[PDB]
Structure 1
Amino acid sequence: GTVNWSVEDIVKGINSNNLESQLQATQAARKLLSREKQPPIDNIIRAGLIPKFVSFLGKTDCSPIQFESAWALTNIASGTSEQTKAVVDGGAIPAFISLLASPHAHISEQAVWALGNIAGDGSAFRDLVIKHGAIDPLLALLAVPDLSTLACGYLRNLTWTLSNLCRNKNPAPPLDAVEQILPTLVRLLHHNDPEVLADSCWAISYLTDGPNERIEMVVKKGVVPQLVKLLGATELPIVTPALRAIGNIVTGTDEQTQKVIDAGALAVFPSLLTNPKTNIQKEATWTMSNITAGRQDQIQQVVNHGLVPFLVGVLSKADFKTQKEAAWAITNYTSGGTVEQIVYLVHCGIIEPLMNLLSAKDTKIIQVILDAISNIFQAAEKLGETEKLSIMIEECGGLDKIEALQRHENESVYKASLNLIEKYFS
C-alpha cells in the first residue's frame, strides 16, 4: 500500500486537500526514509516536504499523521548536519517539544528521539533545544517512583537524548542545564539495564571532561562509588564510558583524584591494564599516569595495590599508544615520588623496558623517557648509587641509545642526552 512510492507520488498525496491521502503519503515517505540502502533524504528535502511534516506534528486531531511525520523527520534529523539543519530550519524544535506531553507514548518517544538527534548535532543545536525548553518536559517523563515500570526502549531513548544534552564542548552545556539534569542522571546510573547504564556513563564522561569546576559538580553528587562499580562490569559498552569518566575525574584536583582512590578504583586496574581491548588498556594507563601525577600518598596507594609491576608490563609490551601513556605514568611517578618509591620502581624492573622505548620514532616519548631517567638518577644521587644505575643502563644497551640521541634532530632530546652522558657516563 505505502511501500516503494516515488517522491512525486508522496508530494501529490501530501499536497491534496484530504487528511487521509496526506496520512497515506506521509506513511509512504516514512517507509522510504526508513530503508537500509541510501534513503532519499535530500530528494525529500528538495521536494519541500519538511514544512508539511512539521505542520502535521501539530495535528492533535490525527495522532497517526503526528507519528508518521515525527518518524519521517527523525530519519532526516539522524542524517548529516545539513539534513539536521533542514529539520531545525523548518521549525521542528518547538513542535517536537509540544509532542513530549502527548498521551500516545509512541509519539512522545519519537519526539524524544528527534530532539536527541537535533541536540546531538553539536553545541549550537544542543543549546537551542535547551532554550526552547526541552529539559523540563523530558525530565517529567522520568518523574516516576520506579524506572522499571517504563518501557525498556522508551527509557533507553530518554537516557540517550539526555546524554546528547550533556555532550560537546566549545562551549560546554550551560551550568544550570547541567545542574537540572544531574539528579535524574544519578538515578539512571543506578538502573539495571546495560544500555541505560552505558549512555548514563557516557553522559557523566562528557560532564567530567573540562575544567575542575565541571568535575566538582559531578563528584559532589556522590556518583564516584557507582562509577567504580560499573568500572568492574562485564559489558565492554559500560566499562568504556565508566573508565572514561574515572579517567576524566583524576585529571582534576588531588581531592577529586582521592575520591576515586577511596572508592577502591585501583583494585580494578590489574585487569584493566591487561584488558584484551587496546583502547581500555590505553585509557587505563592514561588514568594511571594522572594518578601518579598526584600526591606521594596517592603514589603510595598505586604501590600498595601492586600496580607498579602492571606499569612495567604495559611499558614492556602493549600497543605503542599505551606504551607512550606508560612512559607518562613513569615520568610523573618519578617527578613527584620519594626516593624510596623511585628505588622501588627500579627494583620492579622499569629500566630495561624504559631503555628499549628510546628506539621509538616518536620525539615526545623520547623526551618523556629522558626526563624519567634524569629523575631516577637524581634519586640515585641522594643515595650515592649513580654508578649502580649507570651499569644497569649500560648492561641492557641503554647507553648505546642515549649516545645515539646526541645526534637527534630535536633540540630538547639533543641537550637532555648530552647532559646524561656528561654527568653519569663520562
Structure 2
Amino acid sequence: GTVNWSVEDIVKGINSNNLESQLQATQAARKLLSREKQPPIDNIIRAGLIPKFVSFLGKTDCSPIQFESAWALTNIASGTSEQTKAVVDGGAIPAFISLLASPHAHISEQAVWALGNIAGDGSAFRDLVIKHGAIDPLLALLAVPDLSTLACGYLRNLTWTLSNLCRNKNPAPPLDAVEQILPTLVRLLHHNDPEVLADSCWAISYLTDGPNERIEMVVKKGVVPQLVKLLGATELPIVTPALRAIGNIVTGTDEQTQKVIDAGALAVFPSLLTNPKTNIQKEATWTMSNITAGRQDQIQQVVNHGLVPFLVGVLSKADFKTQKEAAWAITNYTSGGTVEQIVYLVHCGIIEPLMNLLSAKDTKIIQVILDAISNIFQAAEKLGETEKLSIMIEECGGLDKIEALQRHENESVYKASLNLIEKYF
C-alpha cells in the first residue's frame, strides 16, 4: 500500500492539505529511508522535505505521524555530516527534546535514537544538543527504582545515546554535563545486559580519555572495581571497552594507577596478553607499558603476578603493533626498576627477543629498544657484570645487528647505537 513510491509521489502527498494524505506519504518516505540497500537520503533532502517533517513532530494530535517523522528524520540524521546538518538546520533538536516527554514509549524512544545520531556526529552537535537541554529529560527516563522494568530495546537505545553525549573528545564534554551523567552511568555499569554494559564501558572509556582531572572524576565514583569484573567477561564486545577504560585510567597519576592494581586488574592479564583477538593483545600490552612506567612498588606488582614472562612472550611473537607496545613496556620497566628488577627481566629471557626486533623497518621502535638495552647495561655497571651481559648480546647475534645501525638514516639512532659500542665493545 505504502511500499516503494517515487519521491515525486511522496512530495505530492505531503504537500496536500490533508492530514491522512500526508501521513501515508510520510510512511512512504520512512519505508524508503529504512530499506536495506542504499537509502535515498539526498533526494529526500533535496525534495525540500526536512522542514515539513520537523513540523509533523509537533502534531500531538496525530501520534502516528510524529512517529513516522521521528523515524524518517532519525534515518536522515544517520547519514553524512552534511546530512545530519540538514536535519539540525530544520530545527529538529528542540522538537526532539519535546518528544522525550511523550506518553508514547515508542515515540520517546525514537526521539532518543534521533538525538543519539545528532550528538554522534561530532563535538559541535553534541554540545548543541546539550545546550538545548537534552540531558535533564534523558536522565528522567531512567529515574526508576529498578532498571529491569524498562524494555530491553528502550534501555539499550537510551544507553547508546548517553554514550554519544560522552564521546568525541576535543573539545571534551562540559565538566558540568559529565558530573550530572556519571551517577546514571555508574548505575548502568551494573545492569545485567551485555549491550547495555558494552555501551556503558564505551562511555567511561570516552570520559577517561584525556587530562588526569577528567580521570579523577570517574575514579572518585568508585567504578574501577566494577570495570575489572567486566575485564574478566567472556563477551568481547564488553571486554574491549572495559579494557580501554582501565588502560586510560593508568595513564594518569600513580595514585590513580594504584586504584587499578589495588582492584586486582593484574590477575586478568595472562588471559589478555595471550588473547586471540589482536586488538585486545595490543591494548593490554599498551596498558602494561603504562604500569611499568610507574612506581617501583607498582612494577613489583607486575613481577609478583608473573607478568614479566608474558611480556617476554609478546616481545617474542605478536604482530608488530603489539610488539611496538611491548618494547615500551620493557624500556619503561628498565627506566624505573630496582637493580634486582632489571636482573629478573634478563633472567626471564628478555635479551634474545629484544635483539630480533633490532631488525625492524621502523626507527621509532629501534630508538626505544636501544634506550632499553642501555639501561640494562647501566644496571650491569652498578653490579659489575657488563662482561657477562655483553657476551649474551653477542652470543645471540645482537652485535651483528647493533653495529650495522651506525649506518642508519637517523641522528639519535646512529648516535646511541655507537655510544654503546664505545662504552661496552
TM-score (norm 1): 1.00
Output the CA distance in 1 between the equivalents of 2:412 and 2:180.
Answer: 48
Alpha-carbon displacement from aligned partner over 1:83-138 (angstroms, at most 9, x marks no partner): 10000000000000000010000000000000000000000000000000000000
* Post-superposition offset of 1:369: 0.2
* SS of alignment partner, residue 195 of structure 2: helix
* Post-superposition offset of 1:169: 1.6
* Post-superposition offset of 1:43: 0.2
Task: State the match for 1:255 in structure 2.
Answer: 255
Task: State the match for 1:232 in structure 2.
Answer: 232
Output the CA distance in 2 between the equivalents of 1:307 and 1:95.
Answer: 54
Output the CA distance in 2 between the equivalents of 1:275 and 1:245.
Answer: 18
Output the CA distance in 2 between the equivalents of 1:326 and 1:410.
Answer: 22
* SS of alignment partner, residue 126 of structure 1: helix
Aligned Cα root-mean-square deviation (Å):
0.4
* SS of alignment partner, residue 79 of structure 1: coil
1:280-295 equivalences under 5 Å are: 280-295=280-295
* Post-superposition offset of 1:326: 0.2
Task: State the match for 2:218 in structure 1.
Answer: 218
Runs of 5+ unmatched residues, structure 1: none
* Post-superposition offset of 1:170: 1.6
Output the CA distance in 2 between the equivalents of 1:285 and 1:169.
Answer: 23
* Post-superposition offset of 1:361: 0.5
* Post-superposition offset of 1:295: 0.1
Output the CA distance in 1 between the equivalents of 2:319 and 2:214.
Answer: 32
Task: State the match for 2:205 in structure 1.
Answer: 205
Alpha-carbon displacement from aligned partner over 1:243-300 (angstroms, at most 9, x marks no partner): 0000000000000000000000000000000000011000000000000000000000
* Post-superposition offset of 1:179: 0.4
Task: State the match for 2:326 in structure 1.
Answer: 326
Alpha-carbon displacement from aligned partner over 1:49-78 (angstroms, at most 9, x marks no partner): 000000000000000000000000000000
* Post-superposition offset of 1:337: 0.4
Runs of 5+ unmatched residues, structure 2: none
Alpha-carbon displacement from aligned partner over 1:337-384 (angstroms, at most 9, x marks no partner): 010000000000000000010000010100000000000000000000
Alpha-carbon displacement from aligned partner over 1:198-217 (angstroms, at most 9, x marks no partner): 00000000000000000000
1:12-411 equivalences under 5 Å are: 12-411=12-411
Output the CA distance in 2 between the equivalents of 1:142 and 1:200.
Answer: 14
Output the CA distance in 1 between the equivalents of 2:280 and 2:381.
Answer: 37
Output the CA distance in 2 between the equivalents of 1:151 and 1:351.
Answer: 56
Output the CA distance in 1 between the equivalents of 2:151 and 2:399.
Answer: 65
Output the CA distance in 2 between the equivalents of 1:372 and 1:53.
Answer: 62
Output the CA distance in 2 between the equivalents of 1:207 and 1:226.
Answer: 16
* Post-superposition offset of 1:36: 1.0
Output the CA distance in 1 between the equivalents of 2:73 and 2:59.
Answer: 15
* SS of alignment partner, residue 210 of structure 2: coil
Alpha-carbon displacement from aligned partner over 1:193-236 (angstroms, at most 9, x marks no partner): 00000000000000000000000000000000000000000000
TM-score (norm 2): 1.00
Output the CA distance in 1 between the equivalents of 2:19 and 2:406.
Answer: 81
Output the CA distance in 1 between the equivalents of 2:132 and 2:183.
Answer: 21
* Post-superposition offset of 1:160: 0.3
Output the CA distance in 2 between the equivalents of 1:410 and 1:194.
Answer: 49
Output the CA distance in 2 between the equivalents of 1:342 and 1:299.
Answer: 11
Output the CA distance in 2 between the equivalents of 1:167 and 1:38.
Answer: 27
Output the CA distance in 1 between the equivalents of 2:18 and 2:239.
Answer: 53
Output the CA distance in 2 between the equivalents of 1:355 and 1:15.
Answer: 73
Output the CA distance in 2 between the equivalents of 1:33 and 1:117.
Answer: 15
Output the CA distance in 1 between the equivalents of 2:169 and 2:233.
Answer: 28
* SS of alignment partner, residue 166 of structure 1: coil
Output the CA distance in 2 between the equivalents of 1:50 and 1:130.
Answer: 22
* SS of alignment partner, residue 406 of structure 1: coil
* SS of alignment partner, residue 405 of structure 2: helix
* SS of alignment partner, residue 195 of structure 1: helix
* Post-superposition offset of 1:172: 0.2
Output the CA distance in 1 between the equivalents of 2:79 and 2:10.
Answer: 20
Output the CA distance in 2 between the equivalents of 1:319 and 1:91.
Answer: 49
Output the CA distance in 1 between the equivalents of 2:326 and 2:381.
Answer: 24
Output the CA distance in 2 between the equivalents of 1:258 and 1:170.
Answer: 27
* SS of alignment partner, residue 206 of structure 2: helix
Output the CA distance in 1 between the equivalents of 2:391 and 2:143.
Answer: 68
* SS of alignment partner, residue 72 of structure 1: helix
* SS of alignment partner, residue 115 of structure 2: helix
Output the CA distance in 1 between the equivalents of 2:191 and 2:334.
Answer: 41
Output the CA distance in 2 between the equivalents of 1:373 and 1:49.
Answer: 66
* SS of alignment partner, residue 405 of structure 1: coil
* SS of alignment partner, residue 362 of structure 1: coil
Output the CA distance in 2 between the equivalents of 1:89 and 1:163.
Answer: 23
Output the CA distance in 2 between the equivalents of 1:359 and 1:323.
Answer: 13
Q: Report the identity percentage.
A: 100
* Post-superposition offset of 1:150: 0.2
Alpha-carbon displacement from aligned partner over 1:377-423 (angstroms, at most 9, x marks no partner): 00000000000000000000001111000111111110001110111
Alpha-carbon displacement from aligned partner over 1:308-344 (angstroms, at most 9, x marks no partner): 0000000000000000000000000000001000000
4+ residue runs over 2 A deviation: none
